[PDB]
Amino acid sequence: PLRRQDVRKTVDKLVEHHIDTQQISPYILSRSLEDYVRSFDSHKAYLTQDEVFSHAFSEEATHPLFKQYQEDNFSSFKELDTCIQQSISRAREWRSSWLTDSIRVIQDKKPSAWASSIEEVKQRQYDLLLSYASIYLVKLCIRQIENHENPYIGINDHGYRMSPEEEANSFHVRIIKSIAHSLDAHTAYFSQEEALSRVDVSYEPYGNGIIGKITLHSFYEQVSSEQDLRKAIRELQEKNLLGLVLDIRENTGGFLSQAIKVSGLFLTNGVVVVSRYADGSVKRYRTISPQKFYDGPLAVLVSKSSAAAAEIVAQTLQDYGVALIVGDQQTYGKGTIQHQTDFFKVTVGRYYSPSGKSTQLEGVKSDIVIPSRYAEDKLGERFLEYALPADQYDNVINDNLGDLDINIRPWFQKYYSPHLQKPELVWREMLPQLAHNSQERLEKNKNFEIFVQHLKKTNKQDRSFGSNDLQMEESVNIVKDMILLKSIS
């Protein structure tokens, strides 16, 4: 199936629900041609810049796509899939001669620019197998770089060449997946064929009480992220809980449903997160009794790998000023919404915190910087190939209850609005004092001084920074300061 005409109808099912773009344009197409050459190959060893350019970026290559797309032609694309074969044919053969001298092969870089000279295309295709070769630490190997090279032939799962009609899928599947990507970073296309269908807890003694350390790896869902934290915090309160550090440095996300649930543990009433979509808006409220489960100093420890769901919690607990966000200066920065539907996984709406500030290309900003593992690594959505720009929404901290029906809306006014959570000042007030001490503590810490060098690869001299969690130890020290500072106010 999947004849040439299937693609134009396939995408119009998608674009109508897409978040920012709802109509194809040559701007989308020029990159639709690029993602074709970036899904294959991600190592840039098959082609020459000149060869890439003339077939991927020449005006003869870039601007006839329209109207060709509407026209279903795909010649500029078909020559590219013809041009790759020539590069493909060259690769295999080069390797055939090395099979002969295999013993020599055994002996033991993404410029975003392909090699200018063909003999340099040689050397890297030559230095390509070295990746999979040196991981151990050939026949078994050579297939691992060919199985993903073969869909441009029409190959079966196991190796047999299939009919042109089932060879027609791959050229047309990889023209649509190369389209879904160009719209934005978080949308790929899924074929039916591809559509086959907890919490660490520790504490440290301090004064006549303790400081809680809780690591949450993801928002999952009587056992959930909300439930286990409740179990932990309550168990800690047996000991005199004086402060709390919340670790989401490795939280790669989870249920939005749980992000609201966790956030409500440190809030009384009010909006937690807002998301518009293509049309409308929904302010996902949080309603709880006057009691907050944990009412005290709270430090949220994050990293560049902290995710959307984690960022939503961090950004929201920051706007209400019940939590100081410590860790890397900026979180991952994922603030978009993706949904299913075969098969599309498309970005449809933007996330917003109660203050209307978004986490889309900038993340949750840290009030106190504590560099994590990924500090010197370029990690974040901003570096994904097609990431959407940042926006902001109206501030909703004081809720007008303005997005409801007038049957329920009065009910809020009487019982939800008067006990609305007021953003706090006490913790963000002592912030310039806390940031000063942290900076001084880190500079005077030898282990942390080493850890910084170690990230910058300037640790020519070999030093060890111990076996303690350095990012956590500082966060504990920040909470120790918060407690004492409050105790003298």
| Residues comprising the chain, all counted | 489
What is the smallest separation between the CB atom of 317 and a copy of itself, expressed in angstroms? 23
Q: Is the torsion defined by CA of 327, 329, 335, 340 positive or negative?
A: negative
Q: Cα dist. 23→10, 20, 36, 75, 279 in Å?
A: 13, 10, 20, 22, 16
159 is an interface residue for a copy of itself by CB under 8 A: no
Burial class of residue 243 in the structure, from the number of CB atoms within 10 Å of its CB (0-12 exposed, 13-18 middle, 19+ buried): buried
Under rule CB under 8 A, which residues in 377-436 are in contact with a copy of itself? 433, 436
| Dihedral pair phi/psi, residue 20, rounded to 5° | -115, -30
Long-range contacts of 462-465 (CB under 8 A, 24+ apart): none
Nearer to a copy of itself by Cβ, of 401 and 483: the residue is 483
Considering only 445, 453, 454, 455, the residue that binds a copy of itself (CB under 8 A) is 445
Stretches 10-18, 60-68, 315-323, 477-485: which one binds a copy of itself (CB under 8 A)? 477-485
Q: Which position among 112, 208, 222, 289 is part of the footprint of a copy of itself (CB under 8 A)?
A: 208
Full DSSP string of 130-165: HHHHTT---HHHHTTTTTTTGGGTTB-SSSPBPPHH
- C-alpha distance from residue 113 to each of 46, 53, 82, 110, 133 (Å): 12, 10, 21, 8, 24
The smaller minimum CB distance to a copy of itself, of residues 83 and 450, is found at 450
Task: Kindly tell me which of 161 and 436 has the beta carbon lying closer to a copy of itself.
Answer: 436
Q: Which helix (H) or strand (E) holds 312?
A: helix 308-319
Nearer to a copy of itself, 395 or 437 (CB): 437
Asked if residue 109 binds a copy of itself (CB under 8 A), the reply is no
* Measured distance CA(120)–CA(138) in Å, rounded: 23
Burial class (CB in 10 A: 0-12, 13-18, 19+), 301: buried
Q: Does 207 bind a copy of itself (CB under 8 A)?
A: yes
The answer to whether 161 contacts a copy of itself (rule: CB under 8 A) is: no
CB of 1 to a copy of itself, least distance (A): 57
Q: Which of 9, 67, 109, 444 binds a copy of itself (CB under 8 A)?
A: 444
Binding mask 177-206 for a copy of itself (x = CB under 8 A): -------------------------x-xxx
Choices 55-63, 87-95, 97-105, 437-445; region in contact with a copy of itself by CB under 8 A: 437-445
Output the smallest distance, CB 136 to a copy of itself, in A. 25
What H or E segment, with its residue span, contains residue 211? strand 209-216
The residue among 404 and 483 lying less far from a copy of itself, judged by its C-beta, is 483
Binding map of a copy of itself across residues 321-360, x = CB under 8 A, - = no contact = ----------------------------------------
Contact between 461 and a copy of itself (CB under 8 A)?
no
By the rule CB under 8 A, 437 interacts with a copy of itself: yes
For residue 158 the two structure tokens come to 């196991």
Structure tokens at 411: 């009910």
* Residue 246 φ/ψ, nearest 5 degrees: -115, 115
Beta strand 298-302 with 346-352 is unpaired
Residue 240 makes contact with a copy of itself by CB under 8 A: no
Does residue 22 interact with a copy of itself by CB under 8 A? no
- Residue 206 CB, nearest distance to a copy of itself (Å)? 7
- Please, what is the minimum distance in Å from the beta carbon of residue 354 to a copy of itself? 31
Please state the separation of Cα 401 from the chain's center in Å: 32
Q: Is 458 in the site for a copy of itself (CB under 8 A)?
A: no
> Is 463 near a copy of itself (CB under 8 A)?
yes
Q: Quote the CA–CA distance of 443 and 460 in Å, as a whole number.
A: 19
**Binding footprint of a copy of itself on the chain (CB under 8 A):** 202, 204-208, 433, 436-437, 440-441, 444-447, 450, 463-468, 480-481, 483-485, 487-488
